[PDB]
């Protein structure tokens, strides 16, 4: 008979190993293309350092995991294990991002 772990369990171990790991979790090229797309909005044909864009993606992902973290916390205060967009919105609200 096929076995399937209970829900979250696999995701739980994923959480554990991700707090274990430290490297990026975003594919480089898509992020870079997104950055250049954003750039051409303000000015077209602008070049970048690989170090620069690595910094962009690292700092972003840091802000992003922080947002995910405190939104997780808020959802704890929301007594749910599922996340709700309003949690993120109000988190930014408390983060003065509104």
């Amino acid at each position: 008979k096929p076995h399937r772990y209970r829900p979250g369990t696999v995701a739980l171990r994923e959480i554990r190993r991700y707090q274990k790991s430290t490297e990026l979790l975003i594919r480089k090229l898509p992020f870079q293309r997104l950055v250049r797309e954003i750039a051409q909005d303000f000015k077209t044909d602008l070049r970048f350092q690989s170090s620069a864009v690595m910094a962009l993606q690292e700092a972003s992902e840091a802000y992003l995991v922080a947002l995910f973290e405190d939104t997780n916390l808020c959802a704890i205060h929301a007594k749910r294990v599922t996340i709700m967009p309003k949690d993120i919105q109000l988190a930014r609200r408390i983060r003065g991002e509104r």
Partner: protein, 82 residues
Amino acid sequence: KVLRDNIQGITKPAIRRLARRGGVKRISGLIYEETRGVLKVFLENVIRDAVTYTEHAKRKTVTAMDVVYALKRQGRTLYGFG
């Protein structure tokens, strides 16, 4: 070479990977694009400000020290890039 729609280039698996790193168990769909937006909005500032530096730098390429001073001015300073 006009770019577009790389925002959805952010994979939902990537988003949930970041969430698991943040220690999140259950997530809804409505978040990701929302997430993406925020992401955009967030970077929406820095690059501009960054190239603003590059603006005054009178240069065509954009450097790390730009975003360094941005995050500094954005009160989100980072280390390891001079």
